[PDB]
Amino acid sequence: GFCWHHSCVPSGTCADFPWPLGHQCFPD
Amino acid sequence: GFCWHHSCVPSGTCADFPWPLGHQCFPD
Numbered sequence: 001g002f003c004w005h006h007s008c009v010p011s012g013t014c015a016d017f018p019w020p021l022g023h024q025c026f027p028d
Numbered sequence: 029g030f031c032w033h034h035s036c037v038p039s040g041t042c043a044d045f046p047w048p049l050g051h052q053c054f055p056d
Binding site for chain 2: 002007009015019
């Protein structure tokens with residue numbers, strides 16, 4: 001999952017980040 | 029800024045996330 005600024009999304013949330021990150025999905 | 033998998037993005041980069049993140053920027 002991903003917690004950023006206290007906002008948390010569950011495991012399985014995949015987000016498209018800019019380069020060089022790209023599509024990063026969060027298993028936690 | 030933000031960095032993940034050694035790929036870092038500069039301070040002020042913004043990315044699109046689902047709720048409850050929504051529109052998030054990486055200030056550091």
